[PDB]
């Protein structure tokens, strides 16, 4: 997270850290969406250009964390995975379209002060909240700058950018399964997700029922926090039908 601040304890209790078993290292962010399901970006699990193709046995999720590096005994919960599901139309070859995956935990987790699920939007929530200029929040233990790492979870609030401005910002082909966020060059505020924040949640708080909803997944960017450039997020609501059918069939 570039130009963010330390998270308050418990401010993102759905934040998950994807963690490699051997070597032991951070791989990506993710989110807790129920007692047994974690949501992340497909490119965190499957990315052929880097010979990345993780199986359930390669990975752990860590939930309830604040420190990036400490083992937070009796606070964090470390879970193995039963199964990984990647969107069947995930497009790694061109633009990361449908950059979404689900991971099912071996056993359901108990919630705690530090561990609790985020909501997924429905039609009504997406329509109300997904508009240019409305701010959401991104969290993660990624790089503090493009070219370094935080001791504790970082947080930054970023505004949604209008779809034409997102498109003009890049020569990569943008689809309706993506949205972008970040401040304009004139706006006197900056901030972005960066390497290691990928897969993590972009969330917004409903003014109607005080609940947090995950509207996006940190997906991709050209650099981190560059003027005229914007972060891209997977559009969760657009892909919600796939999410629902995986959980209904395999849950």
């Amino acid at each position: 997270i570039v130009e963010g601040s330390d998270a308050e304890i418990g401010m993102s209790p759905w934040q998950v850290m994807l963690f490699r078993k051997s070597p032991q290292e951070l791989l990506c962010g993710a989110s807790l969406i129920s007692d047994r399901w974690v949501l992340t970006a497909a490119h965190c699990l499957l990315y052929p250009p880097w010979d990345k193709n993780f199986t359930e046995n390669d990975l752990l999720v860590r939930i309830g964390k604040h420190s990036r590096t400490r083992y937070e005994r009796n606070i964090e919960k470390i879970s193995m995975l039963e199964k990984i599901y990647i969107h069947p139309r995930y497009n790694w070859r061109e633009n990361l379209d449908r950059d979404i995956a689900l991971m099912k935990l071996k056993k359901p987790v108990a919630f705690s002060d530090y561990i609790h699920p985020v909501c997924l939007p429905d039609r009504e929530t997406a329509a109300s909240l997904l508009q240019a200029g409305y701010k959401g929040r991104v969290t993660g233990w990624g790089n503090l700058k493009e070219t370094g790492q935080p001791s504790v979870l970082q947080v930054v609030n970023l505004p949604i950018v209008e779809r034409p401005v997102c498109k003009d910002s890049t020569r990569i082909r943008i689809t309706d399964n993506m949205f972008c966020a970040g401040y304009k060059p004139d706006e006197g505020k900056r901030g972005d997700a960066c390497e290691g924040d990928s897969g993590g949640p972009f969330v917004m708080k409903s003014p109607f029922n005080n609940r947090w909803y995950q509207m996006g997944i940190v997906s991709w960017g050209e650099g981190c926090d560059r003027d005229g450039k914007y972060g891209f997020y997977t559009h969760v609501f657009r892909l919600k039908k796939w999410i629902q059918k995986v959980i209904d069939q395999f849950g």
Binding site: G10, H116, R137, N157
Partner: peptide
């Protein structure tokens, strides 16, 4: 049931330090 309500914040009627920036953007 109570997805999206944080045990240390909304469940205790406590706001985090920057939440109001988000809500202010929705006006």
């Amino acid at each position: 049931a109570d997805c999206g309500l944080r045990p240390l914040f909304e469940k205790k009627s406590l706001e985090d330090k920057t939440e109001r920036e988000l809500l202010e953007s929705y006006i």
